[PDB]
Design a protein around this ligand. Structure first.
Ligand SMILES: O=C(O)Cc1ccccc1Nc1c(Cl)cccc1Cl
Ligand SMILES: COc1ccc2cc([C@H](C)C(=O)O)ccc2c1
Ligand SMILES: COc1ccc2cc([C@H](C)C(=O)O)ccc2c1
Length: 580
């Protein structure tokens, strides 16, 4: 009768409010914290009235009518959000559709800097307001963050402050915890964005195919029926969340988590751990759960997928099922392949049946179908071993450097901050994945690269600058990585005009944390490539070494700025000669 009552009742006041805060922060990213709290409280008050009497006026309206109406009350909307006021003239679903379309993936808000005294203080004078603020700050920075999971991370954030605010060493307890929480936020943000990007750019059939492969790897003892059931339900969950319907998404997620733990015995022995937990931790745990051991009765596949004479009829009679089945089977036995590699193999199997079934004798044609997968598998294994060798020889900083050079050559039109962010994220894939046991390196690498490349695509959507990127981003989800890997120096590119200030450093740099020093150096590196696109990697590496050396010296100096001022312009001129 009243959706708002229903969700309120299912979720309870705490989570209802939390989720409704997230929604509003993500939709209206610039509004101050206080406006949002007020709007939340109001909606929540409405919900309570409806829970008391679902016949009451307007209680029957949809959530989005209700929430969309609420957002359209904010003061200074047309000033703050010029582009959004027009959305408020529209009805639903056209309205919500407009709000979504204008969500910002790179609002470039200030970085969230742990300030342990000020924060423990604010925490103590009002913990409820302190945690709301966290949800708000994160939601706003990541307008597609998986709602339910943000509530989860908010609990971890509360545990952090609970533990550390009364400790001997406040920052010793707290700054590493919050640094690791921020890594976990960024990674989770990037996983969820890929899901919503997959719905937007490729459709639900693409999200389902990804999720069949992934969950078949994770739960290889489950049967296909069960995998499909979970994938169907998980797909709806994310479709809701990616469409800003967070209350429905949370409720539906909890139903799923219950389902999974009721049937954990016929799903995976790894879920026991997770099913013994409170709600949000449980959901988090199932979502991140490790892959089960491979059953001893995995069926040989030749017979059904290469040898049977009826394949062409079966395939024609129901393509999506026959293929989904193939994908389930192949993926469950292949936790050692990435999801994209599995999807590229499925598309080749498909392509082989399309080809062979239109020929005179299909069975002799499709008899060698499994053999066409060999090169699909070797290419990425070889790439991962090569980049991991490099990573291990040179370390994170220089691997990031190598990737920054790589990406600037491929897309020299992209802004420097994007190239640097992206080269740095790509480089961290080496740190995450290369040290893992070797059978894990390919899946770790490609699954994480999908997250980084999607980020590039998402930023590119905002600020299109290169047709090569557009094409790689939109042609084929499964082929993205190979498509990006194949790009080379854009030759059409006119070297960017030399501007000496760009390469000109000052003593300000000396006071930065290491991190931020690297970014400054890494930004100059991209600029060196834009101006000398044909310089080799070996030349850029030497020239940047000379820049680091110079920065280290001048920062070690008696009179830092005089140092920078005398030595710098010479290095700037001479380094250009060392390039292309
Ligand atoms: O770029 C690569 O693929 C690897 C490579 C090999 C030899 C020398 C330098 C580089 N990369 C690289 C670059 Cl392009 C700049 C600074 C530091 C490094 Cl390690
Ligand atoms: C029913 O079977 C499938 C199998 C593989 C698929 C792969 C893809 C990828 C994401 C692609 O890039 O096209 C999509 C749909 C698919 C459906
Ligand atoms: C194992 O570690 C990595 C890290 C970064 C990588 C980037 C690339 C890109 C897509 C490339 O353009 O080749 C490939 C492989 C990679 C492996």
């Amino acid at each position: 009768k009243s959706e708002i009552a229903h969700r309120f009742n299912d979720l309870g006041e705490k989570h209802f409010k939390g989720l409704v805060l997230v929604a509003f922060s993500q939709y209206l990213q610039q509004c101050p914290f206080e406006d949002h709290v007020k709007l939340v409280n109001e909606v929540t008050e409405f919900a309570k009235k409806c829970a008391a009497d679902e016949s009451a006026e307007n209680c029957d309206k949809s959530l989005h009518t209700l929430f969309g109406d609420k957002l359209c009350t904010v003061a200074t909307l047309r000033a703050t959000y010029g582009e959004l006021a027009d959305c408020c003239e529209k009805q639903e679903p056209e309205r919500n559709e407009c709000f979504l379309t204008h969500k910002d993936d790179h609002p470039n808000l200030p970085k969230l800097k742990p300030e342990p005294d000020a924060q423990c203080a604010a925490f103590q004078e009002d913990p409820d307001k302190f945690l709301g603020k966290y949800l708000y700050e994160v939601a706003r920075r990541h307008p597609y963050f998986y709602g339910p999971e943000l509530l989860f991370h908010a609990e971890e954030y509360k545990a952090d402050f609970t533990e550390c605010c009364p400790a001997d060493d406040k920052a010793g307890c707290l700054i590493p915890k919050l640094d690791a929480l921020k890594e976990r936020i960024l990674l989770s943000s990037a996983k969820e964005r890929l899901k919503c990007s997959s719905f937007q750019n490729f459709g639900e059939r693409a999200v389902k195919a990804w999720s069949v492969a992934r969950l078949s790897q994770k739960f290889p003892k489950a049967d296909f029926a069960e995998v499909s059931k979970i994938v169907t339900d998980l797909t709806k969950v994310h479709k809701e969340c990616c469409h800003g319907d967070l209350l429905e998404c949370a409720d539906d997620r909890a139903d799923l988590a219950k389902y999974i733990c009721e049937h954990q015995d016929s799903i995976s022995g790894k879920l026991k751990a997770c099913c013994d937990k409170p709600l949000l931790q449980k959901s988090h745990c199932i979502a991140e759960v490790k892959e089960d051991d491979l059953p001893s009765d995995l069926p040989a596949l030749a017979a059904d997928f290469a040898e049977d004479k009826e394949i062409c009829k079966h395939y024609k009679d129901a393509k999506d099922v026959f293929l989904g089945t193939f994908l389930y089977e192949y993926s469950r036995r292949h936790p050692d392949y990435s999801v994209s590699l599995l999807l590229r193999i499925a598309k080749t199997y498909e392509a082989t049946l399309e080809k062979c079934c239109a020929e005179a004798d299909p069975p002799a044609c499709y008899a060698t179908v499994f053999d066409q997968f060999t090169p699909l598998v070797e290419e990425p294994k070889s790439l991962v071993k090569k980049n991991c060798d490099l990573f291990e020889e040179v370390g994170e900083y220089d691997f990031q450097n190598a990737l920054i050079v790589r990406y600037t050559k491929k897309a020299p039109q992209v802004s420097t901050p994007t190239l640097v962010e992206i080269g740095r994220t790509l480089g961290k894939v080496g740190s995450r994945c290369c040290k893992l046991p070797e059978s894990e390196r390919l899946p770790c690498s490609e699954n994480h690269l999908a997250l980084a490349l999607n980020r590039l695509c998402v930023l590119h959507e905002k600020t299109p600058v290169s047709e090569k990127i557009t094409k790689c981003c939109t042609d084929s989800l499964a082929e993205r990585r190979p498509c990006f890997s194949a790009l080379e120096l854009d030759e059409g590119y006119v070297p960017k005009e030399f501007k000496a200030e760009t390469f000109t450093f000052h003593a300000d740099i000396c006071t930065l944390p290491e991190d931020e020093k690297q970014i400054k150096k890494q930004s100059a590196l991209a600029e060196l490539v834009k101006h000398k696109p044909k310089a080799t990697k070996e030349q850029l590496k030497t020239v940047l070494g000379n820049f680091s050396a110079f920065v280290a010296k001048c920062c070690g100096a008696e009179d830092k700025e005089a140092c920078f001022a005398e030595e710098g312009p010479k290095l700037v001129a001479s380094s250009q000669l060392a390039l292309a």
